[PDB]
Design a protein around this nucleic acid. Structure first.
Ligand code: MN
Ligand code: MN
Ligand code: MN
Length: 430
DNA sequence: ATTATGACGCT
DNA sequence: AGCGTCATA
């Protein structure tokens, strides 16, 4: 009774950009605006690989990881923007810099956790308490929530979609008790008001639109965010969880999209998140381990405790390139040339990072893939990173991998390399 | 022959 | 440490 924890202590939001790289290119090139559009890397192999798709183009069935030539079969008028190439490789700097624009705006409202190049979590608990004390028991007007959906509403005793959003919002606000400054539903609502303000600032100041989710933890906020994309935000209350989860495939929850989620389904013979509630914590721990078991037990009830980490900057800076099919590197001079190309991009990004962020990387990780190996990475080795010098870094990288060559004579490289990776890690203040 | 990343868990 | 898992454009 009075003692069951309900995972309602925090207000957490996740803000995620809409079709992010496409918006970055559409801002730069107005001819791409309001069009079926995609962003592609490379060109020669099957038109290049698509990595971002406008919502107009999704309507034709265009997706990420589609070759452009195949996307064009679905959408003949599809417009394309190409990722920059520098030093023989795709260079993502434009999108990393656009990301910083957005992250710096979000940071004006709260400490954020950068979770990808286009999204961040926000713990709004404190900001909500202050807006509530300002409010002075003042009801929250629907006009303060112009792009908010309330998940699960409307319900009970118009065929438009905006009409439905407003009906749900009205039912939600009508049920609220604004008299209680400790009420979780009220706290989420005020959180949503703040996130409207945040999203308006992002669009005003960058031209980019985004979606958001507001809930009591990161997993629910992430799930919420996707429910009404694009250019909308969604509030998932604690009370909405049993209905939401009763038909929610397990794989849709963050961390459960891979082998663990598949094992949950197979071992327990279930399909939906809600079905997990019928197992004891010990049962779940027995199948999935102590940590996963406790996490699942709480998660299926809408409860999760992972903190929003105060980290706005990536903690690693890496450069990677695949060499697929017949382009695999087979000579020493080839390997050394590409290690240098990667190291030069790495130096450029590291030197900028040092100036911007007052830190220095201290470890260099070198990774390669060899032909035949299914695994992402075949080998991973570290060495010291003592100077931001591309020639030193590439020479050092070569030194750490040079023994991988099964060749008898030194000039050939075998088995051929299908991936090179350089990553700077272990930052210290400077 | 999607690729280019980036965080965190295990032992 | 090195490997594996899961994730995002
Ligand atoms: Mn996005
Ligand atoms: Mn995202
Ligand atoms: Mn995506």
């Amino acid at each position: 009774g009075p003692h069951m924890a309900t995972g309602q202590d925090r207000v957490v939001a996740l803000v995620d950009m809409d079709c992010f790289f496409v918006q970055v290119e559409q801002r730069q090139n107005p001819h791409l605006r309001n069009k079926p559009c995609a962003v592609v890397q490379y060109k020669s192999w099957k038109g290049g690989g698509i990595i971002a798709v406008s919502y107009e183009a999704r309507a034709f069935g265009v997706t990420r990881s589609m070759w452009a030539d195949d996307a064009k079969k679905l959408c003949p008028d599809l417009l394309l923007a190409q990722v920059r190439e520098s030093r023989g490789k795709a260079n993502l700097t434009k999108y990393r810099e656009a990301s910083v624009e957005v992250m710096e705006i979000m940071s004006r409202f709260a400490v954020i956790e950068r979770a990808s190049i286009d999204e961040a979590y926000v713990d709004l608990t404190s900001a909500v308490q202050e807006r509530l004390q300002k409010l002075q028991g003042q009801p929250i007007s629907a006009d303060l929530l112009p792009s908010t959906y309330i998940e699960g509403l409307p319900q009970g005793p118009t065929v438009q979609k905006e009409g439905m959003r407003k009906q749900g919002l009205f039912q939600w606000l009508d049920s609220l008790q604004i008299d209680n400054l400790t009420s979780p539903d009220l706290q989420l609502t005020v959180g949503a008001v703040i996130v409207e303000e945040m999203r308006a600032a992002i669009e005003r100041e960058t031209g980019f639109q985004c979606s958001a989710g507001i809930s009591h933890n990161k997993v629910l906020a992430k799930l919420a965010c996707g429910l009404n994309k694009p250019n909308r935000q969604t509030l998932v209350s604690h009370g909405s969880v049993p209905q939401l989860f009763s038909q929610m495939p397990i794989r849709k929850i963050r961390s459960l999209g891979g082998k663990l989620g598949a094992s949950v389904i197979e071992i327990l013979g279930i399909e939906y998140m809600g079905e997990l509630t019928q197992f004891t914590e010990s049962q779940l721990q027995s199948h999935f381990g102590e940590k996963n078991g406790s996490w699942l037990y709480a998660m299926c009830r809408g409860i999760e405790h992972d903190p929003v980490k105060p980290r706005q900057l990536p903690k690693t800076i890496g450069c990677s390139k695949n060499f697929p099919g017949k382009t695999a590197l087979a000579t020493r001079e080839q390997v050394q040339w590409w290690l240098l190309q990667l190291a030069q991009e790495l130096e450029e990004r590291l030197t900028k990072d040092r100036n911007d962020n007052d830190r220095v990387a201290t470890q260099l990780v070198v990774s390669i893939r060899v032909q035949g190996d299914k695994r992402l990475s075949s080998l991973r080795r570290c060495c010291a990173l003592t100077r931001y010098d591309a020639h030193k870094m590439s020479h050092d990288a070569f030194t750490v991998i040079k023994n991988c060559n099964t060749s008898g004579i030194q000039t050939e490289w075998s088995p051929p390399l299908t991936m090179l990776f350089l990553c700077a890690t272990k930052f210290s203040a400077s």
